[PDB]
């Protein structure tokens, strides 16, 4: 069997990593010579899953032309998202779940995209279609990918198929879908292992709306509780920054990526402007901003018009 | 259910007509509201199949945006091949077997392309995958599509899957794959309903190689037998032409488009030049010219350097 390289997009998500490993397995079990490969660094989320299921991190690669003549794309299809020298190899097949664009083939191929929330959901169909038993080990990676892409079935893109697939895989992998999922999701930005001065600095941008000096920092977690439990220390560091930068307002936006609601911690003179722009009542400088997940589209415009 | 329109490319081939009808059936049996549609005239090959299995010719359409919001594409994906106002509707899904190009979607969709020789081969998988019984009537249309696209399994694109599918469908439809196939393929161009003087003129070009007056006519069939059985009448009309035009050689090249071999019927003084240039032995003025399919590239250059 000519050798094939299977891999997902750049800036690898858990789907791009796990699905590549998963399909490579399926392919090999069907008599081919395939190897899972990644095009970037494996993030914490992915890691937790790889480690939990004792799986080797797919080999890093910069180009494919030098190793093979044909490749298989998973979780993507647009050129920019693919390998660097993609123009120089033949896309044998694509297993994906996104729009189709900036993609084109000179020859026919096995393209299989479905309107589901995760590439793994599709593979799972393919395993059964080819009647190939799924190893406990990999089923977990697949289950991981689904959880990852569907934000634990809470994602707007999640589907009844994704959910039924996750359930099915979680049993085989001998785990509890939601239980394992939360842990994995958590290992994402692991804030529990970060300084209170670190959180207030990650995604922080300063503005000067209405002649007032302001700073809005955001932090994404799968449980606002993890970060609210440390409000004392947060207020401390925030108050410091407010002093050093002579800020009229410092708005920390603690977003729950699962429930799409984000808790706000406003410290400043214009801390009342957060109560106006979002129509809320700050009680301990903490008010739940419902439905707010983006500050560029939901926070900045509503506060600019509040002052 | 929102209404959907299912259709193939323009200048409709039997795959584009039958697969559109077939998949609309599958879709309806699964609870949707779909209608098979065509973008052009139904040719003779397709007709024979439609009539044989008592099936109505899918409705002619010029645009879709006015009727529906979503469409399903079968047997194609490149814009130019699709409907006129394709840009104005949403491609819900694509069941196809060609390269992907000049195609792009804003949203995700169900895209399913396989490296087989016919769109119907894929539908057949899909019927079983969804466990839906295939009505005798439509199985025939699917069988037709496969026969049409694979030139009775002789096509270079034909696959083991296409043949296995044709067999399976042929039984259900209660017919003999190759028996019905030939009749259908024949109804395409149809040489059995053409004058012997008509065949020798479809594609006849005269040359004057080496000071000698010559004429080479070509005829493409799916069974040289259909044309050889009428050799008596052929030689009669050829000999007449040879007399009226004072030809030193009239070479009729009867090409079998299935086997890519073409039988030669040479009548003239230089009738031995065909024996030299092709390295053969004329027996009854008929010798099999193996591998010869083009006269511009394979007959003319080898006969010019022979006389
Ligand atoms: Mn992805
Ligand atoms: Mn994905
Ligand atoms: Mn076609
Ligand atoms: Mn076709």
From Swiss-Prot, chains A, B:
Pfam families: DHH, DHHA2. Belongs to the PPase class C family. Its EC number is 3.6.1.1. Mn(2+) 1 binds at residues 9, 13, 75. It catalyses: diphosphate + H2O = 2 phosphate + H(+). It comes from Bacillus subtilis (strain 168). Keywords: Cytoplasm, Hydrolase, Manganese, Metal-binding. Mn(2+) 2 binds at residues 15, 75, 97, 149. Binds 2 manganese ions per subunit. InterPro entries: DDH_dom, DHH_sf, DHHA2, DHHA2_dom_sf, Mn-dep_inorganic_PyrPase. Its main location: cytoplasm. This is Manganese-dependent inorganic pyrophosphatase. The gene is ppaC. Homodimer. Its cofactor is Mn(2+). One of its GO terms (molecular function) is manganese ion binding. GO terms for cellular component: cytoplasm. PANTHER family: BNIP - RELATED, MANGANESE-DEPENDENT INORGANIC PYROPHOSPHATASE-RELATED. The keyword Cytoplasm applies. It is found in: Cytoplasm.
């Amino acid at each position: 069997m000519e050798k094939i390289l299977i891999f997902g997009h750049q800036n690898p998500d858990t789907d791009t990593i796990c699905s590549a490993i998963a399909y490579a397995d399926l392919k090999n079990k069907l008599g081919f010579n395939a190897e899972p490969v990644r095009l970037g660094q494996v993030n914490g989320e992915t890691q937790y899953a790889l480690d939990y299921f004792k799986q080797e991190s797919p080999r890093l690669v910069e180009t494919a032309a030098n190793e093979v003549n044909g490749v298989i794309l998973v979780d993507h299809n647009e050129r920019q998202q693919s390998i660097k020298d993609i123009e120089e190899v033949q896309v044998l097949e694509v297993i994906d779940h996104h729009r189709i664009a900036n993609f084109e083939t000179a020859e026919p191929l096995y393209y299989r995209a479905e309107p589901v929330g995760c590439t793994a959901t599709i593979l799972n169909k393919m395993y059964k279609e080819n009647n190939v038993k799924i190893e406990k080990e990999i089923a977990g990676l697949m289950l991981s990918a689904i959880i990852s892409d569907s934000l634990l079935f809470k994602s707007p893109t999640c589907t009844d198929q994704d959910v039924a697939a996750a359930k099915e895989l979680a049993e085989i992998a001998g785990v509890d879908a939601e239980e394992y999922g939360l842990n994995m999701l958590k290992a994402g930005a692991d804030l529990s292992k970060k300084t209170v001065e670190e959180l207030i600095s990650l995604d922080a941008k300063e503005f000067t709306l209405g002649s007032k000096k302001v700073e809005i920092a955001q932090v994404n977690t799968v449980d606002i509780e993890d970060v609210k439990k440390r409000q004392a220390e947060l207020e401390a560091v925030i108050s410091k920054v407010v002093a050093e930068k002579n800020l009229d307002l410092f708005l920390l936006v603690i977003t729950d990526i699962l429930e799409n609601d984000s808790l706000a911690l406003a410290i400043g003179n214009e801390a009342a402007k957060v109560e106006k722009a979002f129509n809320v009542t700050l009680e301990n400088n903490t008010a739940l901003l419902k439905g707010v997940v983006s500050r560029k589209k939901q926070v900045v415009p509503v506060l600019t018009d509040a002052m």
